[PDB]
Amino acid sequence: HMRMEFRHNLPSSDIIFGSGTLEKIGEETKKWGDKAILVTGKSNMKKLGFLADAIDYLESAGVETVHYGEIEPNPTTTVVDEGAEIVLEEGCDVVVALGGGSSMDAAKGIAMVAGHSAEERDISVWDFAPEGDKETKPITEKTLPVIAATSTSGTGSHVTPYAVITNPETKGKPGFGNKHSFPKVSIVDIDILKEMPPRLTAITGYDVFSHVSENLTAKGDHPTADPLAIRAIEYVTEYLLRAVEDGEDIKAREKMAVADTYAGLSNTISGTTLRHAMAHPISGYYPDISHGQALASISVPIMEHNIENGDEKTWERYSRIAVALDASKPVDNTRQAASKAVDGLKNLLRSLDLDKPLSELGVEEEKIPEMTEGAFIYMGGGIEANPVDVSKEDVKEIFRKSL
Amino acid sequence: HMRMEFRHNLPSSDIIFGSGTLEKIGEETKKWGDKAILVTGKSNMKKLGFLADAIDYLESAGVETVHYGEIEPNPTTTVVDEGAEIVLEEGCDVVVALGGGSSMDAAKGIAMVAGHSAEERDISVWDFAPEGDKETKPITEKTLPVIAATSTSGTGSHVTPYAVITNPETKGKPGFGNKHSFPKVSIVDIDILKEMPPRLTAITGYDVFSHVSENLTAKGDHPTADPLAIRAIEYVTEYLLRAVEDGEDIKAREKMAVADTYAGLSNTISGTTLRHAMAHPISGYYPDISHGQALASISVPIMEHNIENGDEKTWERYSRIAVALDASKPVDNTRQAASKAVDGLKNLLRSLDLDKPLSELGVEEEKIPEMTEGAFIYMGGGIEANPVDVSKEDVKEIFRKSL
Numbered sequence: 131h132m133r134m135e136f137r138h139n140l141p142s143s144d145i146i147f148g149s150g151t152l153e154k155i156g157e158e159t160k161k162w163g164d165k166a167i168l169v170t171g172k173s174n175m176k177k178l179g180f181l182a183d184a185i186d187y188l189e190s191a192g193v194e195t196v197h198y199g200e201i202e203p204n205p206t207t208t209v210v211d212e213g214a215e216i217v218l219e220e221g222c223d224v225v226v227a228l229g230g231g232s233s234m235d236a237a238k239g240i241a242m243v244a245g246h247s248a249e250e251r252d253i254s255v256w257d258f259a260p261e262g263d264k265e266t267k268p269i270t271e272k273t274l275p276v277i278a279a280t281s282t283s284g285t286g287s288h289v290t291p292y293a294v295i296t297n298p299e300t301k302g303k304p305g306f307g308n309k310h311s312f313p314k315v316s317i318v319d320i321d322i323l324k325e326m327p328p329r330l331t332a333i334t335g336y337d338v339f340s341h342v343s344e345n346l347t348a349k350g351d352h353p354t355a356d357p358l359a360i361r362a363i364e365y366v367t368e369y370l371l372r373a374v375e376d377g378e379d380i381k382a383r384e385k386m387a388v389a390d391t392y393a394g395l396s397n398t399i400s401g402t403t404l405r406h407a408m409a410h411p412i413s414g415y416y417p418d419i420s421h422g423q424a425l426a427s428i429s430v431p432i433m434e435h436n437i438e439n440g441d442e443k444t445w446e447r448y449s450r451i452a453v454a455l456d457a458s459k460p461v462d463n464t465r466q467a468a469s470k471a472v473d474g475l476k477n478l479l480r481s482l483d484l485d486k487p488l489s490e491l492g493v494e495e496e497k498i499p500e501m502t503e504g505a506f507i508y509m510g511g512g513i514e515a516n517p518v519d520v521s522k523e524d525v526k527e528i529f530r531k532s533l
Numbered sequence: 534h535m536r537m538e539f540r541h542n543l544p545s546s547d548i549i550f551g552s553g554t555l556e557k558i559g560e561e562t563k564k565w566g567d568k569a570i571l572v573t574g575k576s577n578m579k580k581l582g583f584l585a586d587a588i589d590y591l592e593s594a595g596v597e598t599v600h601y602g603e604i605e606p607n608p609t610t611t612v613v614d615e616g617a618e619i620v621l622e623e624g625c626d627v628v629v630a631l632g633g634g635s636s637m638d639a640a641k642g643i644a645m646v647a648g649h650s651a652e653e654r655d656i657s658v659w660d661f662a663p664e665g666d667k668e669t670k671p672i673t674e675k676t677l678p679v680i681a682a683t684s685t686s687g688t689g690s691h692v693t694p695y696a697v698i699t700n701p702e703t704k705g706k707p708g709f710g711n712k713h714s715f716p717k718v719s720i721v722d723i724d725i726l727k728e729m730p731p732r733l734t735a736i737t738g739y740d741v742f743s744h745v746s747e748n749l750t751a752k753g754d755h756p757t758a759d760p761l762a763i764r765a766i767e768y769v770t771e772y773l774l775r776a777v778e779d780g781e782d783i784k785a786r787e788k789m790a791v792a793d794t795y796a797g798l799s800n801t802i803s804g805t806t807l808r809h810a811m812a813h814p815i816s817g818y819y820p821d822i823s824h825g826q827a828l829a830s831i832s833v834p835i836m837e838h839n840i841e842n843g844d845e846k847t848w849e850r851y852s853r854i855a856v857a858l859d860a861s862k863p864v865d866n867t868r869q870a871a872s873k874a875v876d877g878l879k880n881l882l883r884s885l886d887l888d889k890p891l892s893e894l895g896v897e898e899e900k901i902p903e904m905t906e907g908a909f910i911y912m913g914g915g916i917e918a919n920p921v922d923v924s925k926e927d928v929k930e931i932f933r934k935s936l
């Protein structure tokens with residue numbers, strides 16, 4: 131028998147789940163600081179009034195708050211480094227995020243730069259970011275505390291250590307972070323998430339699926355992630371299209387937010403693999419391409435590559451994904467059983483109108499070697515976590531079949 | 534639709550799983566202190582040589598080690614308070630446990646008393662222990678760090694905050710603890726666990742089952758515990774009897790240790806209910822009664838009481854336990870579907886020869902009001918977590934049907 135061996139690492143988590151739990155953001159932030167920077171996008175939290183509420187709760191708590199409403203989707207290094215300067219100029223001591231993955235990741239990055247800076251700065255968030263064998267600057271407990279109120283049922287970021295930051299100079303979009311950048315408190319407010327439009331629901335829903343299906347097939351044993359990852363796929367199958375079709379379907383919103391929370395916990399314990407490794411350089415080189423659509427448009431060729439070069443242990447995992455996707459009934463450890471996950475994936479992608487080749491999003495064949503070097507330089511952990519090897523041209527071939 | 538609302542709290546966890554992972558106990562302890570007290574039972578870790586190994590690894594690391602090999606099953610306050618005096622006399626700075634729940638709980642208690650003491654003591658572990666409305670002494674970060682190497686696939690204690698300590702004066706056996714008594718590092722070594730005798734395997738295996746089945750039916754929503762709790766019951770059904778019948782069945786040992794780890798994580802997030810509340814006063818008043826046999830001997834009347842006074846939401850949960858116990862195929866939310874969990878429980882109890890009335894263990898009817906007051910005074914959280922109310926005589930009646 132093959133001995134099972136793993137190390138499970140999961141930072142402390144504190145999750146406040148329910149509708150109206152934004153009311154708690156002030157009291158919880160005060161436990162961690164007296165002067166918050168509130169990190170949000172530019173318009174949607176404002177428009178739907180949750181921004182005003184959050185400011186009200188923080189200040190009614192008695193947390194002085196500087197609003198940084200500058201985060202655009204796929205946050206950049208300049209937006210993070212500028213946010214940290216505001217932290218250092220105003221003497222903020224806790225970073226609060228209200229927004230999707232882009233805001234929560236910018237928030238964690240601001241926490242990192244600002245906690246490790248001198249008085250004015252002398253460091254960039256890129257110093258923490260993987261870049262080939264470049265020795266990264268260690269992320270330490272100096273990282274400012276982060277409070278995360280998520281507004282998407284998508285990235286898991288309210289319960290992960292990771293920030294995903296794009297350098298516009300190199301187009302890298304790596305992820306980085308550890309126990310010191312994991313949010314001290316995570317607020318999941320159904321009243322915010324139920325305002326996601328249909329298409330944002332579907333994109334971020336597919337991100338939930340992408341995490342847990344990759345977490346399950348990552349190389350090695352990771353049993354503590356697996357029941358959460360499986361339950362998440364089962365909730366995606368049962369509830370994501372319900373949420374896309376009726377945003378006011380509260381049970382469907384709750385299950386997607388539970389599933390999104392499973393995915394963050396699962397992505398912390400396990401890790402993503404080749405699908406994320408190649409999806410990030412897509413948003414790096416094409417910053418208006420959603421992360422969840424980049425994932426969707428390359429999923430079928432990658433899943434088919436992993437099954438074809440896999441083994442019995444990997445196939446069994448893909449077979450369990452197929453059962454959870456309702457594309458199959460019995461779990462088995464064969465190439466054929468694993469292939470039904472490809473059938474289930476295509477149905478999911480079709481039900482959510484995510485099945486689009488990379489050409490339809492604006493990606494051009496000329497950018498293949500650029501993105502391929504992007505995946506290995508900035509997402510090397512994902513390539514190494516993939517259940518099968520991929521060479522540099524393995525990845526270029528995958529990109530082209532996704533075209 | 535019924536809105537879902539919960540708060541999830543899970544302290545940082547670091548789990549080293551595999552065979553031969555006792556080799557890591559020294560390096561990991563050194564990260565937390567230079568002078569450990571090693572908290573073990575009296576004979577079995579010594580006899581099987583893991584005690585010598587642990588001392589060797591700790592000192593070969595360079596951790597000076599004082600052995601406290603005095604823990605008897607169902608640890609008492611005097612054994613904890615005496616262990617803390619040795620900590621304070623020798624200036625130990627990290628508490629290391631190698632043993633079952635009894636050693637890990639004694640270790641956490643030693644960490645608490647010794648971290649909150651003056652120079653010689655002036656405090657008992659009982660000061661931290663629930664006792665009716667007695668204001669308990671707060672358990673703070675002063676708690677010494679705890680390294681836990683478990684030797685049973687039973688209590689979950691290597692990944693819970695809780696210590697269960699008996700006061701011989703009152704016979705109370707409450708549990709207590711929080712984030713500051715959760716082990717900094719948890720080592721799960723298949724080579725130690727595979728030495729559990731058959732009967733200890735079955736007893737501690739049923740403890741694994743008791744945690745997750747109670748965690749699933751505890752009042753309120755607790756979605757982050759549930760997939761782990763379900764997977765644990767599925768592993769108990771598939772592998773516990775294999776482990777009892779062949780202790781060298783390594784796959785069965787691994788799955789039980791994974792299941793035991795699920796149960797600790799799940800018992801931290803959720804909580805136990807009436808079965809544990811009444812099982813503890815049994816070991817409190819009868820200290821040679823195993824915790825897992827006390828649980829077993831009262832399980833059928835309690836599960837039948839919770840189903841009979843339950844609702845659709847509770848019944849659905851018991852129905853999922855029945856499916857996971859292989860006693861049923863479809864999940865439904867009816868009294869009848871939930872009742873098949875009682876059929877599945879009896880099969881499990883019969884396959885492990887745990888089906889014994891309280892009379893067969895030595896419990897006498899005269900002790901019912903004593904144990905009943907024990908459950909409410911010392912295990913009030915479990916009674917309140919139970920999905921249905923129980924009055925003081927509800928509990929006395931349950932005890933008598935278990936006789």
Ligand SMILES: NC(=O)C1=CN([C@@H]2O[C@H](COP(=O)(O)OP(=O)(O)OC[C@H]3O[C@@H](n4cnc5c(N)ncnc54)[C@H](OP(=O)(O)O)[C@@H]3O)[C@@H](O)[C@H]2O)[C@@H](O)[C@@H](O)C1
Binds near residue numbers: 203235
């Ligand atoms: N830290 C982590 O663990 C991970 C984070 N990731 C990264 O997360 C980012 C994507 O985040 P998402 O949450 O999907 O969406 P964004 O934060 O970019 O916002 C996109 C648009 O949606 C809007 N939005 C968010 N919640 C809304 C709501 N309730 N109602 C209406 N609109 C809402 C946003 O409005 P704003 O522009 O005002 O911010 C934005 O326009 C990407 O940059 C991705 O790379 C992923 O890579 C992920 O796998 C891992």
Ligand SMILES: NC(=O)C1=CN([C@@H]2O[C@H](COP(=O)(O)OP(=O)(O)OC[C@H]3O[C@@H](n4cnc5c(N)ncnc54)[C@H](OP(=O)(O)O)[C@@H]3O)[C@@H](O)[C@H]2O)[C@@H](O)[C@@H](O)C1
Binds near residue numbers: 574605687696730737
């Ligand atoms: N802190 C927590 O979260 C919980 C701990 N609990 C508490 O845990 C204690 C029971 O622990 P267990 O692990 O089941 O067993 P014990 O620690 O008492 O040891 C019992 C006997 O088994 C022996 N043993 C343990 N591992 C062995 C091994 N690999 N091979 C051979 N023998 C082994 C032990 O040998 P020693 O006497 O030398 O210690 C002991 O005699 C009870 O006191 C229980 O109340 C439970 O209440 C539980 O629900 C919650």
Ligand SMILES: [Mn+2]
Binds near residue numbers: 285337340341406421
């Ligand atoms: Mn993602």
Ligand SMILES: [Mn+2]
Binds near residue numbers: 688
């Ligand atoms: Mn127990």
